[PDB]
Amino acid sequence: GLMQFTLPVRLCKEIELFHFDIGPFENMWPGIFVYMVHRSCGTSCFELEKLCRFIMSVKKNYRRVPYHNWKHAVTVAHCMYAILQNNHTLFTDLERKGLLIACLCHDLDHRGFSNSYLQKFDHPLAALYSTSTMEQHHFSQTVSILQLEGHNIFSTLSSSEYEQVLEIIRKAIIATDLALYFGNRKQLEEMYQTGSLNLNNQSHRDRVIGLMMTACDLCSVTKLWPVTKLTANDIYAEFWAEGDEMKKLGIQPIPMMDRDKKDEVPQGQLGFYNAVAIPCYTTLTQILPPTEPLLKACRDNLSQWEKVIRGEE
Ligand SMILES: Cc1ncc(C(F)(F)F)c2nc(CCc3nc(N4CCCC4)nn3C)nn12
Ligand SMILES: [Mg+2]
Ligand SMILES: [Zn+2]
Numbered sequence: 001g002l003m004q005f006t007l008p009v010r011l012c013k014e015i016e017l018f019h020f021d022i023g024p025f026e027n028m029w030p031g032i033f034v035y036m037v038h039r040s041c042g043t044s045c046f047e048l049e050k051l052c053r054f055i056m057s058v059k060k061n062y063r064r065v066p067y068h069n070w071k072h073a074v075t076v077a078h079c080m081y082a083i084l085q086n087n088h089t090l091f092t093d094l095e096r097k098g099l100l101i102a103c104l105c106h107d108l109d110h111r112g113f114s115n116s117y118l119q120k121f122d123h124p125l126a127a128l129y130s131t132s133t134m135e136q137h138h139f140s141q142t143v144s145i146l147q148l149e150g151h152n153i154f155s156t157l158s159s160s161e162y163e164q165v166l167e168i169i170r171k172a173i174i175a176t177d178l179a180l181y182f183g184n185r186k187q188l189e190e191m192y193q194t195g196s197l198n199l200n201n202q203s204h205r206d207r208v209i210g211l212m213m214t215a216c217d218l219c220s221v222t223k224l225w226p227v228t229k230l231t232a233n234d235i236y237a238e239f240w241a242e243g244d245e246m247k248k249l250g251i252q253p254i255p256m257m258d259r260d261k262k263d264e265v266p267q268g269q270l271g272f273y274n275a276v277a278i279p280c281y282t283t284l285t286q287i288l289p290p291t292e293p294l295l296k297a298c299r300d301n302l303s304q305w306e307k308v309i310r311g312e313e
Helices: 007-013 026-040 050-058 071-085 092-103 114-122 124-128 134-144 159-175 177-193 202-217 225-248 260-287 289-312
Strands: none
Touching: 007 225, 026 050, 026 071, 026 092, 026 114, 050 092, 050 134, 071 092, 071 202, 071 260, 071 289, 092 134, 092 159, 092 202, 092 225, 114 134, 114 225, 124 134, 134 289, 159 202, 177 202, 177 260, 202 260, 225 260, 225 289
8 A cells, every 4th residue: 555666776767768678687577567557557556466466477378489478568568658658648547557458468378470370370269360360369368367366457447447448458459460550550640641630539549559559569679779689689589480380381481581581681670660660650759749769769770770781780
């Protein structure tokens, strides 16, 4: 009740910035998450005992893959924290509650393979969920963990509040399917530019929360260059294992997933920052101006990838 989570001074100041790295000490990540809920939501949003048990069951359901792991979950949640704290007054209490949980949960039980590989392998999850296969799985795992004894962090909510928050989390987790991002950002771009964008329209809110999810999900491109560059090595460690598995099924992988195209990595990054990252953070900055430091950091990392190609990095 009278209990506040605190952090050492360098973490207490730097956790408020978009470019914070949560560090290599795994055992601090739960306390960092609770810290962020307490400040973005309040010490009253969740029963501590339930939240702690929820966080630990979530952790235990992330797998030790190179990229889609528990460290990614807490990272994606820290970027959401930064966005929420810089746009305090645009979001409901349910949204604040819902989005940090959504982010912590958004890759639950990820196996290090894309929707496309599950569909080519004919994994049972691809018969249960024909599109956004892992993302429907992640929400399904979130509901499982919420239904364990002593894990319903939302038990204090009304039936209708409970249903709204699970609906926010579902839509937020689905939006992390990058196949959906392109159309979502296009609509948002057109709505912002024609001035039709209306934050009282629930279906507009949805699209805006969807774009925030894509921004948080991609936030490795918004970090200090060494973090960005070393995360890219984890990302490719997964993509190249997937490429190997595609070849095992007798299918030439796309170049992104082929370890034989290691040398094209710099140009593949440029394509990615130009086709995905920069547009994502541009539109987000138009809609929520205090998120500009994510766009400014993305453009700095693009220019670091340009330096690598020129031989200067
Ligand atoms: C930094 C980052 N964050 C998130 C994601 C993701 F979308 F997947 F979440 C992501 N994907 C990639 C991969 C980019 C990429 N490499 C390549 N090839 C072509 C041949 C050499 C490399 N083609 N392309 C488009 N980087 N990356
Ligand atoms: Mg995902
Ligand atoms: Zn993710």
